[PDB]
Write a protein that binds this ligand. Sequence first.
Ligand SMILES: [Mg+2]
Ligand SMILES: [Mg+2]
Ligand SMILES: [Mg+2]
Ligand SMILES: [Mg+2]
Ligand SMILES: [Mg+2]
Ligand SMILES: [Mg+2]
Lengths: 199, 109, 190, 352, 138
Amino acid sequence: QVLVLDGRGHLLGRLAAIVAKQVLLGRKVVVVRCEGINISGNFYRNKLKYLAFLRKRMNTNPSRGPYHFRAPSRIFWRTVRGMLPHKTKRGQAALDRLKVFDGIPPPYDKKKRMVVPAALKVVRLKPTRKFAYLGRLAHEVGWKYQAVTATLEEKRKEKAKIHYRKKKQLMRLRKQAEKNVEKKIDRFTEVLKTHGFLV
Amino acid sequence: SGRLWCKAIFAGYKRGLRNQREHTALLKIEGVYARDETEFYLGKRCAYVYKAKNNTVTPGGKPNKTRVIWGKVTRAHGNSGMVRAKFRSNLPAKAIGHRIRVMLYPSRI
Amino acid sequence: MKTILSNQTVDIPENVDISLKGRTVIVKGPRGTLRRDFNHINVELSLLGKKKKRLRVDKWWGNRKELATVRTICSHVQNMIKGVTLGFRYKMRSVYAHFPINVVIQENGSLVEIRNFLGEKYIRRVRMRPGVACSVSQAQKDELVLEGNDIELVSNSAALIQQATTVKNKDIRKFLDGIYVSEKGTVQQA
Amino acid sequence: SHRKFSAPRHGSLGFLPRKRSSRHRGKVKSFPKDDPSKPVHLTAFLGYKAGMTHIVREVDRPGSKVNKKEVVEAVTIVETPPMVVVGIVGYVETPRGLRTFKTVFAEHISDECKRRFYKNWHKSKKKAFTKYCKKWQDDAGKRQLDKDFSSMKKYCQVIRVLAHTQMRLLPLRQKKAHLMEIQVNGGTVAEKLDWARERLEQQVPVSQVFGQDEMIDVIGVTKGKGYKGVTSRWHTKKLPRKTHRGLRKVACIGAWHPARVAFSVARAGQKGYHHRTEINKKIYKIGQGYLIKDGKLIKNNASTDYDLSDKSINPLGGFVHYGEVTNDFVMLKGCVVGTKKRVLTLRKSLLV
Amino acid sequence: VFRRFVEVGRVAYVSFGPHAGKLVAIVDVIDQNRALVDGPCTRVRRQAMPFKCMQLTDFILKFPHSARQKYVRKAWEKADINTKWAATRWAKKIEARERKAKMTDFDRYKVMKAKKMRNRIIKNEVKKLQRAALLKAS
RNA sequence: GGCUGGGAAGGCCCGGCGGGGAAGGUGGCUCGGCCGAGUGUUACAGCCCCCCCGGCAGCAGCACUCGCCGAAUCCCGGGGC
RNA sequence: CUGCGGGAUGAACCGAACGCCGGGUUAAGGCGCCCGAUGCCGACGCUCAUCAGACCCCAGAAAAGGUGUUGGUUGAUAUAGA
RNA sequence: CGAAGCUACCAUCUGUGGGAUUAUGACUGAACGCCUCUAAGUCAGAAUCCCGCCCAGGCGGAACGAUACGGCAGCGCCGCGGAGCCUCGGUUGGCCUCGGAUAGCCGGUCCCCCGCGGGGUCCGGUGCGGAGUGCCCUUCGUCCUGGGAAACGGGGCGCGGCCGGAGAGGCGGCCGCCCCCUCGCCCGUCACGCACGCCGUUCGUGGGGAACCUGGCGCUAAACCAUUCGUAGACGACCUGCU
Ligand SMILES: [Mg+2]
Ligand SMILES: [Mg+2]
Ligand SMILES: [Mg+2]
Ligand SMILES: [Mg+2]
Ligand SMILES: [Mg+2]
Ligand SMILES: [Mg+2]
């Protein structure tokens, strides 16, 4: 009953608008791997935009001024918050349902994560256009834990490779076992393929 | 023995940008995302079920804490599967983005 | 507008064996093996004919800007084939008026130190790209030879050692000193 | 309008949370970077500011007018009795930070270390670590400790050791020991963990980690000076004698259009007792404490190859407001932050 | 690496539009994203059809680029495009989708029972094979 | 119902006239097993297309939905609020 | 002396003028999220900006340049070989 | 004249490293058979920007110690039971590769290499994805006996061992022993308040928070005030000592 989305290959605003709309409808949304987010335009454009945002601060007291979060997950969180009525109680309650993470944390490392084709770079962006990765942008503006995240993601990918190898073995054995006892399930298979299955 | 109502979400009231009409609610039925599948749900009874501190009567059962506000599907709302509904009493606005069950027995098929 | 079809072919010699991993050309031959990934170019990389005699590149519905990639990929493949067959040798001469330029290779040819450039006490240690080996040329009083398979790395190392010897805060037209590339050829001419 | 004559601002904006320090013991914000090639060692120590004195030394700087010339330089004495290892702490890297993984203490804990665990030692029943020590004397507890060490070896990447000072050997009034984590830098994680486990319930002399003519960092809290005016706190210009409403002030607090006083404007408040970290403090001499083989051995404190006397670093009548230095001491060039009896953290240089 | 081309006589499948889910053959190319199309054996007249709404299969019949609707029909009949298309996996999957769409509640109950028995039999066989494989490994 | 008394289209086509793409053909060359595929040149039609002479029910703004205006040249039924 | 919908904001702008309500439909404006509605399998082209651009009043720019790119006009020469 | 304490460039000590790049200079290379730092790609690059060092530390977390024996008391884990107040969301789950888009998925791998598995060559099947989220998994009436197909599966918060999992693990996997049941698919065979048409039915839930009734296994305080000290201080606060 909770949406888990993989942030790799998704555009910032395109995914943020959809996530905010779903969150306002009472849906619980989890966004994972926020370093895979990419933004349209060359890297220098987005670097300059984030530096210009960094310049924004209260002259009399920067502590009370804007909070420039450097983590990619917090950057995505702020972009989503910009698309919500966060000043109202309803907006805050909706924003409480949102949850973002750098990398893929252990609570969600063993879950299937969905992707939104309406926010993917391969779909929404021309192949000849340039883009910038959110992880590299964050690392060059103050982020500290890019290498640790990369190492943990490599370990997680190795574990996922082991699990996927086991799944391949299980599926291959399942397919062979179906062939072994195909004579005892012929009547069950015929009715399945009569109504539009296994075809 | 199972669920006999479709899931819907109280998206909000009928409104413009700066004016809100609380006598008509907007419903988001799950699985309907076009202004062509909403014809089935037209006229369907809808209820908002909630619980409260004090006990109330219950048809065919002992008194419980559950109270409901009954409603009716009126018309579709703008090409996206949104449905306008009218209730005997306006919704409390606390149920924004909460579950509203639309029944299946104003049957006409 | 959009050109319906633009294509160009490269005729490789029988010595060179070329393969493509979708859009990554791997070229191997006598001198070694060269790899170059041709992604982010969006062209149809076709290898037609027995013995892989010819390599064809295609571009469908491309504008003026996307059209030059067809020629540039062919040029890169030609350079790679030339490097894997004959190689690239860059000869550069050190030019000076009063102070002679003392150039010494340090490890094998990778680390090059330049001494007594305009009398400067500072010594420049310049590292070259992997796969390129520098040496002190013979039969010439002051010349360096840069050899390698990839033209890009050899030329980049030559540019690095050209820019290492630069005169500051003086008339560069009068003070014509430094090491400049004099010849761009191949290790073996055949 | 622009100011008529330009002048650099008073004070540093990089030092101005000007609040009384929350901590009394100096804190190491960042330990030296760990490389797994050099042998295992500690990188921190705790000393006490004893006093200050002179020194005579020939200079060996060619080209200077002072080359091969004797000079008088101020040196500060920091008494450093050996510390006792009582436990180790492990850390694991996280995309959110570096959280502690597991802490294991020793079977025996001195009363001095237990002093830190109680705010009122007189009223306390001294029950701390009563059930914990049962682990070290039971098979189930030993197995649990072995599993803890194995888990720390497998998962942790940063290892720090808990050590406390021996306040019994100091002449100070207080008896509560100072406990601090010291990061172990050296070989692999397993080697560092095993070396730390061996050093459990053992004394570590200062001479092991620090050597002569070595640049170190001193960390501590500044002398407290209470509420001070803007003239003393920020060293602003004094208004002339004709000033009516006080001349030890700042005349223009701010401009009109920004209807607030900025955080960069100098104002009165707390001065002193600030946490500071000085750099490039040179160890002129590492002294050997009082030891007895036949009688007292007091010469080594202040005897040199040219004096060969029986002097000690303690002046006549002892150090003023501190006492007598008996244990090992470290001599640092120049001055250090803090008053007498102030606990000082000695840290290795973070730079080559 | 392209195996599908917009060639004169290429058979195309219409994804969406008025003639959705009907085969059609390309006659001539009108523009970059528009071509003249003709569907005589699939109840499609000759009119322009954009490339967006058509996905072309691997059937190509040969006829001149501007034939008058008569020779293309003859080539379609000689090549027997309908039978070849019905033999393909693509049409079988489309028919499976349609059968799923038209399945009634009684048929859904029958399918539920059939799957209930079949999955249990298959998973019992899979468990036995897993035990045999573990025995072989040891 | 009207229109260009709709424009094209569909089927059997018959007796002709010319023109153009450039093909079961020829052919310099290229790629594979006489054939298959790709380019050019004069170029009739056994791949076709277009105009002129003329005639058949097969039509109908056609559920092969290729684009109109419509209603004493217009009526019936059903669903929701 | 005048409320209402839109122009984020608002004297005069656009639409439209006022009793209390239910249903339906519009104007001017809009339909990624804030925010009601394109969550159309919208159509044809143009544009890369390390100062992009984004809707009367209106909240900002000129002369002069660019083989950056996309169309048009005129003029020559090229198998007697540019 | 002057102790101690404060104090003066009026004495003395200390003041640091990387990354991305701007301008600029370049490499390869077309557009434009030539040339070109630019179009694709690449290099060097600074009182620039960011970070490190440094200062403060989130209505932000972590590990560890003791956890009220009393003269009345009060707790912490386990299981299985009763009412008794408040607060709500819900109305089967999916336990997972990396990934590219002018390409990808699955096996055998006759062949080779590397640590049952991984990598490469070749071969064979699909690709508007049927090893499809346009998807998969489970049935959502009960019980009697009376047949066929399939079959040793499941349960008693079943009891004891071996592990994986540390990013914020908070979940699962693998083995031993007792008892009980004949569960899934097709048909016979009846019986289940059949409450005589009328709405919040059907669950995650033994839900979460607070107060009271059963037992088994472990507990014995610390904080603050008061006093004391000055490394502290306007007062609070802070560093300390006291069977
Ligand atoms: Mg309920
Ligand atoms: Mg000035
Ligand atoms: Mg006066
Ligand atoms: Mg740099
Ligand atoms: Mg660079
Ligand atoms: Mg440049």
